[PDB]
Amino acid sequence: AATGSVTTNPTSNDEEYITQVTVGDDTLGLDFDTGSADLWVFSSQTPSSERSGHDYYTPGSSAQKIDGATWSISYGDGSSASGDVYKDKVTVGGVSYDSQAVESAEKVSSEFTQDTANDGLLGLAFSSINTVQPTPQKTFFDNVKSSLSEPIFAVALKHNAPGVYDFGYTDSSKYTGSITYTDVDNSQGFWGFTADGYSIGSDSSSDSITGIADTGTTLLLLDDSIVDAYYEQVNGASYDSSQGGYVFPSSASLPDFSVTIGDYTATVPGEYISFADVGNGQTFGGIQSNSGIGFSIFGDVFLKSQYVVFDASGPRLGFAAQA
Amino acid sequence: XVVXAX
């Protein structure tokens, strides 16, 4: 069709979101990642010890291997995967493309093999950063956008509940008010943008924040000055070297965190900042430092409170409060 | 957590 929708479900602690997709004759759970442009899956070529417990892709009669083509990717958390390439039909909630480049994994790192629900990733960043060699391939979105009613996809990730990915249209029953747009900087292949300011509780700052919208990143990673300022308002909070981040008494009161985009205020409920248990009655925070990255990453912790529209016509990004 | 293609 010219439009389509599909359910996406979080894994424990909302660490990542999984979406069922049909690759060839196989239905797999993939992590939709706007932070990368490679669609790769666990397959019959993946060593048995590494694909144990995962559903996988087996090239069928509709598959055609791209001779001499290879891919290799490294992610921000150090994880990785590599293999060869096939072209096959891929269907996402009714929307299909018969010649999508499917990257078959021959090697996959431990971060991926342990989480049995994750059978690969579907990249939604700009195709300019696809890693296939010698010739780069296009993302599923770039291949189908011309056939969609509108060249866009929107996402409504939810906290410990079913959410949705919309293709070709915006679902007015998923958000309230109107959508506010901001320009996108895709010079580095990502959905980069700049927020006009932020607020810790009611303390608002005119300071600007530049970063990327990444469905494939768990937390909200920002500059140390903002991170430190946030936890100064959280009694009992302190940096824990063993866990690699700020933690605080599970009973502590957490202030809301907001980012200003134009005349719109995107607010992250303090309750969502309580990310995970770390023992001793303490909780690991949903907001941590972007140290090293070089820029901020608006991950799931942030995205799960908004209905976000990724518009390729601009490129532009749209935000609205979830309904 | 994870951080997806630096």
Ligand SMILES: *[C@H]1O[C@H](CO)[C@@H](O)[C@H](O)[C@@H]1O
């Ligand atoms: C895409 O979305 C449109 C609008 O909801 C539907 O009419 C179509 O059938 C498809 O689900």
